[PDB]
Amino acid sequence: SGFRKMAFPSGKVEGCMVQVTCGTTTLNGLWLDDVVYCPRHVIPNYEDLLIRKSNHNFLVQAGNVQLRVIGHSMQNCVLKLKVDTANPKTPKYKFVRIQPGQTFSVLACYNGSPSGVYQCAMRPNFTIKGSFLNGSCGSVGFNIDYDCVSFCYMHHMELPTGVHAGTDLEGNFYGPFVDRQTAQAAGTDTTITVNVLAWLYAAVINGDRWFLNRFTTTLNDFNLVAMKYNYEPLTQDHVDILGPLSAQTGIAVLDMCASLKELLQNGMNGRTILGSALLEDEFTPFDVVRQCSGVTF
Amino acid sequence: SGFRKMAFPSGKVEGCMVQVTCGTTTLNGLWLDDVVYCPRHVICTSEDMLNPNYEDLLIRKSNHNFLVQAGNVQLRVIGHSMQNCVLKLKVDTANPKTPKYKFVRIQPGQTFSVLACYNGSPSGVYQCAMRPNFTIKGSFLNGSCGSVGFNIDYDCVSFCYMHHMELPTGVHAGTDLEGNFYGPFVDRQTAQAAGTDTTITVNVLAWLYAAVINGDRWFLNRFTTTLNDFNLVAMKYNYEPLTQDHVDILGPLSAQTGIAVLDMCASLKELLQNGMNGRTILGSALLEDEFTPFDVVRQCSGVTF
Ligand SMILES: N#CC1(CS(=O)(=O)N2Cc3ccc(Cl)cc3[C@H](C(=O)Nc3cncc4ccccc34)C2)CCC1
Ligand SMILES: N#CC1(CS(=O)(=O)N2Cc3ccc(Cl)cc3[C@H](C(=O)Nc3cncc4ccccc34)C2)CCC1
Numbered sequence A: 001s002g003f004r005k006m007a008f009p010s011g012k013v014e015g016c017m018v019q020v021t022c023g024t025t026t027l028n029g030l031w032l033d034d035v036v037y038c039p040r041h042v043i044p045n046y047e048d049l050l051i052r053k054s055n056h057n058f059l060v061q062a063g064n065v066q067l068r069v070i071g072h073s074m075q076n077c078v079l080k081l082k083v084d085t086a087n088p089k090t091p092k093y094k095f096v097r098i099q100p101g102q103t104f105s106v107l108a109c110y111n112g113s114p115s116g117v118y119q120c121a122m123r124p125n126f127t128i129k130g131s132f133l134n135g136s137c138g139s140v141g142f143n144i145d146y147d148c149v150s151f152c153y154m155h156h157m158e159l160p161t162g163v164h165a166g167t168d169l170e171g172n173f174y175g176p177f178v179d180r181q182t183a184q185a186a187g188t189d190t191t192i193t194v195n196v197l198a199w200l201y202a203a204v205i206n207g208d209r210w211f212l213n214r215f216t217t218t219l220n221d222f223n224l225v226a227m228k229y230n231y232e233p234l235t236q237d238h239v240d241i242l243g244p245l246s247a248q249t250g251i252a253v254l255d256m257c258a259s260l261k262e263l264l265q266n267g268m269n270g271r272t273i274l275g276s277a278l279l280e281d282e283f284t285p286f287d288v289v290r291q292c293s294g295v296t297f
Numbered sequence B: 001s002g003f004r005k006m007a008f009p010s011g012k013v014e015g016c017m018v019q020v021t022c023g024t025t026t027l028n029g030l031w032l033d034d035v036v037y038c039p040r041h042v043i044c045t046s047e048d049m050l051n052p053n054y055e056d057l058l059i060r061k062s063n064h065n066f067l068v069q070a071g072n073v074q075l076r077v078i079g080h081s082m083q084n085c086v087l088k089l090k091v092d093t094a095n096p097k098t099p100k101y102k103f104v105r106i107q108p109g110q111t112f113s114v115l116a117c118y119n120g121s122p123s124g125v126y127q128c129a130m131r132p133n134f135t136i137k138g139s140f141l142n143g144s145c146g147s148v149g150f151n152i153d154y155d156c157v158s159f160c161y162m163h164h165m166e167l168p169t170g171v172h173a174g175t176d177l178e179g180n181f182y183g184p185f186v187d188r189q190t191a192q193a194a195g196t197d198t199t200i201t202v203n204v205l206a207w208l209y210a211a212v213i214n215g216d217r218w219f220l221n222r223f224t225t226t227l228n229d230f231n232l233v234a235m236k237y238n239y240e241p242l243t244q245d246h247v248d249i250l251g252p253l254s255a256q257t258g259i260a261v262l263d264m265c266a267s268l269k270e271l272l273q274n275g276m277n278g279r280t281i282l283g284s285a286l287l288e289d290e291f292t293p294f295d296v297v298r299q300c301s302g303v304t305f
């Protein structure tokens, strides 16, 4: 029993964190094989600013050991520093781009040293509600599938509302952001409907059934209601994805949708669901199945 | 900016997790130097659990009855001893991944990271707190026994908890790494229940200061309170008493924000009376009590917004 916001074990990623200094800027880098990946803003016309730089201008520190930079190149908003030593701690890995609604673990670092790990979701507005201070740039987001680390996020900046923006490991931003000090704001956000539904199934599995009702709804009627509360539309793919949890609890997805509709129109009436007075949307259907089954890495 | 429930990076602990099998029972062990630490109930059957005599059960075991697995490598057990509710298995190989460590016993209200494991394999990490009733609200399934709680301030791992059991309400009970249980609990399947739980007042206050540091002041008021009047009110909402030690501990956050502890106590009294009225504090519609004053100083900025 119990349902917590759970992150993946961070050990395979801790062994990849390094410090990258160039001039006055110090941030974090990801050392995989003989390449260190970091935000290109560590150096604006980025190609023009990069030609001036030489390999020795980039100081890379792995623990108390200085790494030698032997080459450098740019791929979108990420800088790739070729180093003379392959990371002996390089795990099995992939670079994957995630979609809004998907969750991942963040290993927050300062000066190449990991300080904390937390779980979060890519918001529908492409921002992440993280916890980062100055020096956290280059901190990474990841998932673990078997023994393979899938790197999905690299931290670049904070927006005026306190939310964060970044790129995949190929340097492509999540959202309409640019890596420069300019006027940019997060769009109006929405609630991840398929995730709230998954968390309602997690509550039923843990013995919290007060919100269940005898009613059902059509997918169209549910979406008409959900659009009025700034909830993301629920697709047939979302319904199919919730199939296993619907089979385990005996509550059809549209049956649970009628529960969600009543929760949106009436509130919780002084009651909580899994210790929360708000509807939680940062657990995917796979997160719920994994945590209520005990998958290891 | 931002405020998340943050766990310590788990890598130094992952390199210590092993699987311990005894007969039909399999659970997790903590391999530090040449010793594997695990719950002593690994020697029990489900029948034994009602009234187990661990000394009688242990004397019948030999070193080769304990199977210890570190990854895909079998460790050889060369000795065994019991210390309170923990079993210590002497192994023939020192863990080359043993970090710098300490065994610390924590007090209620203290927070720590839990690395939840099954079959000696880590599955997840989460942050939690020792409740005032000495239980923890964890996320544990069968096979998680032996999973550990820890803090990593500096590069030293301080082990503070080892998981032993789930009580009937779904909450969890366990020991420090010297085998002493937190609370009036026993490693027996006897009728035992967690005492009525209370809210960790000093932690809610710390989290209110974290909200002020992050730029939120809607809940503040023009009032102050005496410590005694605050406690008379707090007890009525099942909040733990606030002591002078708690007030002293909040001193640095009070100095950083410019809000006296007894003025922050007056905002809390008012929040308990009025609720949040559709508002949130740091993305939460409830008053959060699983961040200590030390967690807030570690996670938040040194400059108030
Ligand atoms: N807006 C804004 C702020 C950041 S900044 O103006 O100092 N800033 C401009 C900038 C422009 C482009 C790029 Cl790609 C990065 C960056 C940097 C960046 O965001 N860094 C950070 C990243 N994360 C968490 C931070 C917390 C605190 C301060 C920096 C933080 C630096 C001022 C309030 C937050
Ligand atoms: N009450 C109860 C339950 C546990 S048990 O009856 O299976 N059980 C009795 C027992 C008694 C004393 C001691 Cl020291 C250990 C133990 C064990 C124990 O708690 N294991 C576990 C530990 N953690 C999380 C679990 C979740 C699920 C099942 C086991 C879990 C075994 C049944 C619902 C939880």
Ligand SMILES: [Cl-]
Residues within 6 Å of the ligand: B105, B106, B107, B110
């Ligand atoms: Cl303590």
